[PDB]
Design a protein around this ligand. Structure first.
Ligand code: G4K
Length: 366
């Protein structure tokens, strides 16, 4: 019993590519907004509680859909030729979101250092004075508008007169990218450990939160004191190496995006090098799409078959792209002999203990 409010052609600026491309967009009553390469539901495509901008720069008659998703502000910009069509779309979208909607101080946190800076806000490392704990704080411009073992938990959320703050857990066992850099390669077991905890997390986001992480890379993986994995959520509205082929063409991305990303991350750990690397970005784009995956000829076939299935070009042919989603990967030979309920319960003994005295140890901040 879901109806379409409006439907038509629009010029969409690529979310990852700076050029304009024509896509066929559909606006359903539930608040879904999906574009297609040609005329033929993850919460990523939701237009629920989004802002609508009307700009004339660079291209005239351009409108932007500013959305706050969890703790990250996203922008979706579109172009139409006639100024009246922009009015027909904006009034339609707004009425949908409107109809869809109807149906602690900062004084406890010492500013330690700046972690990042974006268009609508910053990320700062802070210390909770009362407990001496270390958290990351997303502060976002107010004008813009439950917990998993391996996700950086959102602990607090409060407002000021002009900005909106999100206090999130900050792992103190260092970043996984640097850890890989010291060892320069990871054992199959260690990579299996790390991959497993991610699979559990991706399953959570997909099956329960109904969302795609969409930016799974080495730079977003950290370790807690014990050695378990924390997937970070520190993105602001500011890398072509990790991009999926489906995201490249800007057509119908889905849960498979996270599975492509997983393959790339697990490749770097067991191979020690990026699967598709080139200084030239344009050659790297042709590399991802056209070139066939290569291997060091020193890996167990299980891992080789896992990465092969994860780094296939077609999202539906790609491992975990089907309806079963994560379970396709959980049943894999490389993940045979692993009890997954124990993975979620942190029952898995970490192959690496970060050199940390306690939760509050500040060694890995150098
Ligand atoms: C200015 C730059 C810009 O606009 N970039 C941009 C453009 C378009 C984008 N579309 C996108 O999808 N993104 C992504 C936004 C999300 N982000 C990663 C990410 C994914 C999921 C979560 C998350 N979401 C929820 C939702 C509901 N309940 C939850 O408990 C959630 C938890 C999480 C979560 C996941 C991991 C760790 C902690 C919490 C958060 C972030 C990638 C880009 C665009 C970006």
């Amino acid at each position: 019993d879901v109806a379409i409010v409006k439907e038509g052609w629009l010029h969409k600026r690529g979310e990852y590519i700076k050029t304009w491309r024509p896509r066929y967009f559909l606006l359903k009553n539930d608040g879904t907004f999906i574009g297609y390469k040609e005329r033929p539901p993850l919460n990523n495509f939701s237009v629920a509680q989004c802002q609508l901008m009307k700009t004339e720069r660079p291209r005239p008659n351009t409108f932007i859909i500013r959305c706050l998703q969890w703790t990250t502000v996203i922008e979706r910009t579109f172009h139409v030729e006639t100024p009246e069509e922009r009015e027909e779309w904006t009034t339609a979208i707004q009425t949908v979101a409107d109809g869809l909607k109807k149906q602690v101080t900062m004084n406890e946190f010492e500013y330690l250092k700046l972690l990042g800076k974006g268009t609508f806000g910053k990320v700062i490392l802070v210390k909770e004075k009362a407990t001496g704990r270390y958290y990351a704080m997303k502060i976002l411009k107010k004008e813009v508008i439950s917990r998993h073992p391996f996700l950086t938990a959102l602990k607090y959320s409060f407002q000021t007169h002009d900005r909106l703050c999100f206090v999130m857990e900050y792992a103190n066992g260092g970043e996984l990218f640097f850890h890989l850099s010291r060892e320069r390669v990871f054992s199959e077991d260690r990579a299996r450990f790390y991959g497993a905890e991610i699979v559990s997390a991706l399953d959570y986001l997909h099956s329960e939160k109904n969302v795609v992480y969409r930016d799974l890379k080495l730079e977003n993986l950290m370790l807690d004191k014990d050695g378990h994995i924390k997937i970070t959520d520190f993105g602001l509205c500011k890398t072509p190496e990790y991009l999926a082929p489906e995201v490249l063409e800007d057509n119908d991305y889905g849960r498979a995006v996270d599975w492509w990303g997983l393959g790339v991350v697990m490749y770097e750990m067991m191979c020690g090098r990026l699967p598709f690397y080139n200084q030239d970005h344009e050659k790297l784009f042709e590399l991802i799409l056209m070139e066939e995956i290569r291997f060091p000829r020193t890996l167990g076939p299980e891992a080789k078959s896992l990465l092969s299935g994860l780094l296939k070009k077609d999202p539906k042919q790609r491992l975990g792209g089907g309806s079963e989603d994560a379970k396709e990967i959980m049943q894999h030979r490389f993940f045979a002999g692993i009890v997954w309920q124990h993975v979620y319960e942190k029952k898995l003994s970490p192959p690496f203990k970060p050199q940390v005295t306690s939760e509050t140890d500040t060694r890995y901040f150098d």
